[PDB]
Design a protein around this ligand. Structure first.
Ligand SMILES: Nc1nc2c(ncn2[C@@H]2O[C@H](COP(=O)(O)OP(=O)(O)OP(=O)(O)O)[C@@H](O)[C@H]2O)c(=O)[nH]1
Ligand SMILES: [Mg+2]
Ligand SMILES: [Mg+2]
Ligand SMILES: [Mg+2]
Ligand SMILES: [Mg+2]
Ligand SMILES: [Mg+2]
Ligand SMILES: [Mg+2]
Ligand SMILES: [Mg+2]
Ligand SMILES: [Mg+2]
Lengths: 49, 49, 49, 43, 49, 50, 155
RNA sequence: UAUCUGGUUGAUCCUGCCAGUAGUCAUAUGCUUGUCUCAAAGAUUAAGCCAUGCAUGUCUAAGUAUAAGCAAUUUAUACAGU
RNA sequence: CAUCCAAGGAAGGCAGCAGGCGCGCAAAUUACCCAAUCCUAAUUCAGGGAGGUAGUGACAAUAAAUAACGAUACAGUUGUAAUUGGAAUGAGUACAAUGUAAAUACCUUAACGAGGAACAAUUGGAGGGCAAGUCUGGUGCCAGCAGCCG
RNA sequence: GUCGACGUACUUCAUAGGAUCA
């Protein structure tokens, strides 16, 4: 039963989909920027100052 | 990225107050955007163009 | 690349890259102006009615 | 810094008004029994 | 700028609406109204159910 | 904080997207016990929203 | 306009200067219909007093300033604060504004008779799009102020 | 089923009937969740598919060291410690 | 079925411990250690996701806080207190010590920790009453529905 | 095809009797 849902249409293209938008939202001073730099380094091995 | 295509000569002859022509670059998302010009779009915090 | 004409100059002058620029297509009904009938309730955590 | 208030923190929502006697069952039963004794004295 | 002109128009309208909000309501919006409070034969013009 | 709660309510009404809670500044805690209690309270409150 | 079922949220304050400490999400809702006109209406009550009573029949004053007004409201439904229902029968020629009414039961002098009526209301066509990106500060966009704020400002 | 409640008429009793009220266990789910001891974690009859890491090595005085290994040395020019 | 590839070839088996997919809707940590239990070896010594330790949705179970003793006040010897007096204590914080392989926790304990004791117990059910308010019906002033809206 | 038979799952109608009183 829990598999059932309202049928809908997904318009994501089959080929070459756009990048997923990841928004780092939070109060000031929580560490949004330092999170992005750490994440970017892991995937690309280069630090964005 | 954001780019202003206004010819600087128009900026000086008429002044900074003149309306500008701008080019916006980015990935498209959601349903396909029609190719023909004249499509109405709303830029959040600016207005409808 | 999308080019817009008659863009206000304040957008170009007061341009902060930190603030995102979100463009959204508009369906025909979004263009029309008129009276909107809706069901609305005060947010539960909002102090005043 | 805008810390969340008590309503947002506990999120008790809309609840009925409950007498303080419900917080401790021992006190509630003590009051019930003494009231019952006062009622026996009339029976 | 055109945006600035829009701002003057809007500010004029905000001044008007602030003044209207402060102003004492019309007799029709006072709830109970007696013949003395409202203009004589005010109901003649108006459409009431 | 209020901003965190304000965003969630906006997202909930406009179509809830994937939400991942990331807790920082945990090194500021001085006790392991109180750190676990804050994590448990913080996690359960977060579960109600998302 | 926007298609039905479109949810939305409403806020009263967007400027950082007026944020304060309270929650800023003021309203939530779902648009049900789109139209070009609406017929909001408001209750308007006419308040008068009786001066001469003949059992069920009675004469009332202070509904109306002239027999012009009574002319339309003949047969109108009226009742007292006590709940005795009545009808506006006929306008007295003298004095102006006085009319004869009949009630299901005899009314008292101290009673107040009221006529229920409905007054149309109009929606104000005010539209002030938020244009934060066009501002230098981008975080203190301010538009029409709240009634409480205006009253405080003028004292 | 029992007990209790209610309906069976112009009313009250005595029968009878009718309806609701019992149960732990199991599955799913909702709201709440402060302290001490203790303890388990299956399930689409899908024994369906797996990124990544680990899960099986082992030398005593007592099988084989000229490691161009280490450190001790003339306790050791066959070796002798590790 | 499926990974790498210079396309010539090469490498696969989590119904082991963690952790993923199987949906678009969901649930333990990719944690520490061999200190105990025992197992393997040439062996007292090395290894052991076997196993233990801790973390994590109220699985199933045990015990058990959220106040106790008075005075005053008000009301029909009973009830009610955002009244009032000074005594008690742990939830929590924390020197320390104990605990442990190292830690967390427990048991101890200096110093803090209580009147709205806001240090803010919950989940269900039953029954009211209020209006210049709203709707429906009719052997007048009534009845039904109901009443966050006067 | 508002088709027939069967199987399965449900809905429904048949409850008042004696005594006293007015
Ligand atoms: N001690 C500690 N400091 C942290 C942590 N996360 C962030 N910080 C500090 O918080 C400060 C701000 O970090 P940022 O990366 O600038 O956070 P931000 O989201 O960019 O903040 P804004 O850009 O000002 O809106 C830095 O000095 C960080 O060192 C954390 O976990 N522990
Ligand atoms: Mg930053
Ligand atoms: Mg604890
Ligand atoms: Mg829950
Ligand atoms: Mg408590
Ligand atoms: Mg304790
Ligand atoms: Mg040697
Ligand atoms: Mg596994
Ligand atoms: Mg040997």
């Amino acid at each position: 039963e829990r598999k059932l849902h309202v049928p809908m249409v997904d318009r994501t293209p089959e080929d070459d989909p756009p990048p997923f938008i990841v928004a780092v939202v939070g109060p000031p001073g929580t560490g949004k920027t330092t999170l992005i730099r750490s994440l970017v380094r892991r995937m690309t091995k280069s630090t964005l100052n | 990225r954001f780019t202003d295509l206004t010819h600087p000569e128009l900026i000086e002859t008429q002044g900074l107050q003149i309306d500008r022509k701008v080019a916006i670059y980015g990935y498209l998302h959601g349903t396909p955007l029609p190719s023909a010009p004249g499509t109405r779009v709303h830029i959040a915090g600016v207005g409808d163009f | 690349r999308i080019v817009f004409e008659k863009v206000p100059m304040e957008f170009v002058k007061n341009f902060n890259p930190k603030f995102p620029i979100v463009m959204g297509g508009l369906l025909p009904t979004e263009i029309k102006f008129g009276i909107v009938k809706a069901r609305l309730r005060r947010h539960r955590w909002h102090k005043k009615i | 810094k805008r810390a969340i208030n008590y309503q947002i923190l506990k999120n008790k929502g809309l609840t009925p008004k409950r007498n303080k006697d419900n917080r401790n069952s021992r006190v509630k039963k003590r009051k019930k029994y003494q009231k019952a004794q006062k009622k026996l004295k009339s029976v | 700028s055109s945006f600035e002109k829009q701002q003057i128009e809007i500010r004029k309208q905000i001044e008007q609406l602030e003044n209207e909000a402060v102003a004492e309501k019309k007799w029709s919006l006072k709830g109970e109204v007696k013949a003395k409070d409202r203009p004589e034969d005010a109901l003649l013009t108006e459409e009431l159910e | 904080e209020m901003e965190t709660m304000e965003f969630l309510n906006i997202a909930q009404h406009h179509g809830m997207p994937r939400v991942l809670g990331v807790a920082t500044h945990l090194d500021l805690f001085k006790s392991q016990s109180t750190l676990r209690a804050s994590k448990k309270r913080l996690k359960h409150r977060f579960w109600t929203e998302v | 306009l926007c298609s039905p079922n479109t949810p939305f949220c409403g806020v009263q304050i967007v400027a950082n200067s007026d944020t304060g400490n309270g929650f800023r999400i003021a309203a939530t809702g779902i648009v049900e219909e789109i139209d070009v006109n609406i017929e909001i209406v408001k209750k308007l009550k006419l308040v008068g007093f009786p001066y001469k009573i003949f059992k069920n029949t009675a004469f009332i004053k202070d509904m109306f300033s002239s027999a012009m007004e009574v002319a339309r409201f003949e047969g109108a439904q009226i009742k007292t604060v006590s709940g005795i229902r009545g009808e506006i029968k006929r306008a007295l020629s003298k004095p102006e504004g006085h009319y004869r009414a009949a009630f299901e039961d005899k009314i008292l002098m101290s009673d107040i008779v009221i006529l229920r009526s409905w007054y149309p209301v109009r929606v104000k066509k005010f539209y002030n799009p938020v244009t934060s990106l066009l501002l230098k500060e981008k975080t203190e966009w301010k538009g029409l102020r709240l009634t409480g704020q205006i009253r405080a400002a003028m004292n």
